[PDB]
Amino acid sequence: QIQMTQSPSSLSASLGERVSLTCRASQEISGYLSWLQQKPDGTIKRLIYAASTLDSGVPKRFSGSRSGSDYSLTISSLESEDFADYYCLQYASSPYTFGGGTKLEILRGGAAPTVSIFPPSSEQLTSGGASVVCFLNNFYPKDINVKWKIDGSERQNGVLNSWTDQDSKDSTYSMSSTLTLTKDEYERHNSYTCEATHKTSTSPIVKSFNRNEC
Amino acid sequence: DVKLVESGGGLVQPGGSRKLSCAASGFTFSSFGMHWVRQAPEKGLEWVAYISSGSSTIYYADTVKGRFTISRDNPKNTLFLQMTSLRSEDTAMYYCARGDYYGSRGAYWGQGTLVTVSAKTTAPSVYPLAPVCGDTTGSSVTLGCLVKGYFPEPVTLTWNSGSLSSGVHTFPAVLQSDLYTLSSSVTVTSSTWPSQSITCNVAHPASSTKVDKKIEPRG
Secondary structure, X not given: OOOEEEEOOEEEEOOOOOEEEEEEEOOOOOOOEEEEEEOOOOOEEEEXXXXXXXXXXXXXXXXXXXXXXXXXXXXXXXXXXHOOXXXXXXXXXXXXXXXXXXXXEEOOOOEOOEEEEEOOOHHHHHOOEXXXXXXXXXXXXXXXXXXXXXXXXXXXXXXXXXXXXXXXXXXXXXXXXXXXXXXXXXXXXXXXXEEEEOOOOOOOEEEEEEOOOO | OOEEEEOOOOEEOOOOOEEEEEEEEOOOHHHOOEEEEEEOOOOOEEEEEEEOOOOOOEEEOOXXXXXXXXXXXXXXXXXXXXXXXXXXXXXXXXXXXXXOOOOOEOEOOEOOEEEEEOOOOEOOEEEEEOOOOOOOOOOEEEEEEEEEEEEOOOOEEEEHHHOEXXXXXXXXXXXXXXXXXXXXXXXXXXXXXXXXXXXXEEEEHHHOEEEEEEOOOOO
């Protein structure tokens, strides 16, 4: 029941860079602190135990150290394979406590999204609903802005967005934006536009379709 | 390599109970202590309990102290986690781990078991998103699949029974009201579709729902 304070909560680092994660305990733990990495598939895997002893098979580029209160994990040279969330753990006192964790995002070159729009399926329509979907794929940075426009006017109500966690293979993100209306509202407008604004471009990426004519 | 499969999870009415399991394999179960770690939705890992191999030492987090009971069946290579007086705060993904947190292989399906503390199951409605417009990528065309209106999570989604794994993005479920919507996009070559039949396979275990939806031309 010792509180572990971890920093930074998150960071973006270019591959090859040095990363230092730090953990502080609310009371003495005499080096009984581990650093585990939770891989993207949920897998938890200890890297260091006893504050600075590497587990076997753990790459030599990881190392722990203690500086008074400070417990430090250092990754000299980030590898793509080190894409994960890192947490520190104190196993000194009977109620084990983890650090807040650190969400590591791998810094990368700009990437413009590949925008695609999808009109409501016939199945949904028969159901009385109309969901227009737009997929903004493989971009970077994660910051992106999506606007929905029915005919001319920009619709704000009924949009449900969802981002993708950084792709562990190409360091890009994807987004999915959905505007949901009833079949009666859908059936009485024409063009449905999904325009995205991203750092990679000055003008909005626009995709649309006019319904009408089955 | 050591494999460890969590498998209790599901919807539970608050105040309700649940008993999770973790099938350890790949090592001498009997010689190791084990842990139960959990992770809330927008929160980080949290240690839950610990049990020595002799079941002689048992630690529980202050949080679950008194409602959860850890146990294991040595000749059966299994760890258990009896949950009780389930609070919404217990809603999280549960993972079991060897005492030394040795990175373990999981199940073909994934890692951990989710258990939601809440209200009512609802089957999703799977809808095929074809182009017409469905704005390709280039000489590559993208197709989608929308799973909407379901509860609770998870829903398993694959393309062509898993054969189609490259180019697919499955965006995480988003709860609106008290139902979830999830979508998946898959990018194939302009040459693949509509020639090669692409199907969206969705499974919502929590309601015995399993649907396969073939994406066909139009929009």
